[model samples]
Target: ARLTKLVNAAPVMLFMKGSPSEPKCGFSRQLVGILREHQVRFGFFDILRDESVRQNLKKFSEWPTFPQLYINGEFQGGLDIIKESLEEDPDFLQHALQS
Candidate 1:
């Protein structure tokens, strides 16, 4: 239930290692930057603050990593995929956020 609620906490959910202002990991920092760069407002959870969330999300999303991104309550992917998505469509974030 918690994980379900968390995934849809916002239209764009970023489960990262730390806060947007102070990212604990480089991957988290990069994703945060991408979101900020697109001016996409998002909700975030600091996985480092909750070990259960950190571990459970891997199984929940079947993503097996940190900095997982969810848009419209769907697993979007981590850094590499996001980067590739953007490359394929420069307006990917904008469309995802609006959609």
Candidate 2:
């Protein structure tokens, strides 16, 4: 089901427009940058290359947006929320569990 698919997708995944090295948009760029800045290891899924992934993810997460972040097969909202959390809790990045 949904859980199985997500687990197989990645340990920590960001469904974005481009790879972490080359983000296609500002938000994706910023989000990936933050994770890297924090030394967070993750996987990237380029939604632009696969429309089915984008559509299914929207339905899977009940969210209609790109750059959705997932941690250990759990939805972690979007970039803005992640940014705010990082800003508010500087220790979050260091303590975020991967699996």
| Predicted structure with the largest TM-score when compared to the true one | 1
Measured with C-alpha atoms, the lDDT of residue 58 in candidate 1 is 96
Off by over 4 Å in 1: none
Question: What digit string (tens of lDDT, one per residue) describes model 2 on residues 21-63?
Answer: 8899888998898888877778888889877767888888887
Q: Count the backbone clashes (under 3 Å) in each candidate.
A: 0, 0
lDDT agreement of model 2 with the native: 0.78
Q: What is the lDDT for 33 in model 1?
A: 97
- Candidates in order: C-alpha RMSD to true structure: 1.1, 2.2
Cα deviation of 74, candidate 1, in Å: 0.4
Clashing pairs in 1: none
* lDDT tens digits by residue: candidate 1, 24-83: 999999999999998899999999998888999999999988899999988999999999
Q: What is the lDDT of residue 39 in candidate 1?
A: 88
* Residue 95 accuracy (lDDT) in model 2: 48
Off by over 4 Å in 2: 6-8, 94-99
